[PDB]
DNA sequence: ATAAAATCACCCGCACAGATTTTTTAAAACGCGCCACGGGATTTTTAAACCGGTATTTAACGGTGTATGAATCCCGTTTTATCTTCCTTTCACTTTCTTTCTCCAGT
């Protein structure tokens, strides 16, 4: 209800995995077909 | 190299609150002087003590029915004891400027 217990390990793992996957797949690595990051493609 | 979140100076007019800065004014002070007042030595008069006596006026005493003084419990007020601090100060160190001493190539 208003208060629900949660273990710290699960929260840490979920949040860090989400952040790491988002950063790896959508911010820093280029594509092999056109060699562009998402920001470059959006600007163009 | 991509993301998340932040910070400061000045220009132009106008109205007002607060902080210096002259300017004026009333109190305190100084010097000189004179006459109002108090001391000293006589006259005069009256306030209060003393004898009466009488005629009131007060205070001590015995019942009822309260209003308040000491005790307890709190909370804002002011004192006092107790921490940190920025400018003064020198001072050994470092840095930076000024003069001097050679080198030294050229003729």
Question: How many whole angstroms separate alpha carbon A10 and alpha carbon A8?
Answer: 6
Question: How many whole angstroms separate alpha carbon A44 and alpha carbon A42?
Answer: 5
Given a contact cutoff of 8 angstroms between Cβ atoms, the answer to whether A37 and A27 are in contact is: yes
Number of C-alpha atoms within 13 angstroms, CB side, residue A39? 3
Resolved by: cryo-EM
Question: Nominal resolution in Å?
Answer: 2.3
Tell me phi and psi for residue A35, to 5 degrees: 65, 40
User: Which nucleotide is at minimal CA–C1' distance from A26?
Assistant: B2
Calculate the angstrom distance between C1' of B46 and CA of A13: 124
Calculate the angstrom distance between C1' of B43 and CA of A36: 143
Name the token pair of A28.
């820093």
Calculate the angstrom distance between C1' of B100 and CA of A18: 75
Question: How many whole angstroms separate alpha carbon A3 and alpha carbon A25?
Answer: 34
């Amino acid at each position: 209800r208003e208060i629900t217990p949660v273990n710290i390990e699960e929260e840490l793992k979920s949040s860090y995995l989400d952040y790491a996957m988002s950063v790896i797949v959508g911010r820093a690595l280029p594509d092999v077909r056109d060699g562009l990051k998402p920001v470059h493609r959006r600007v163009l």
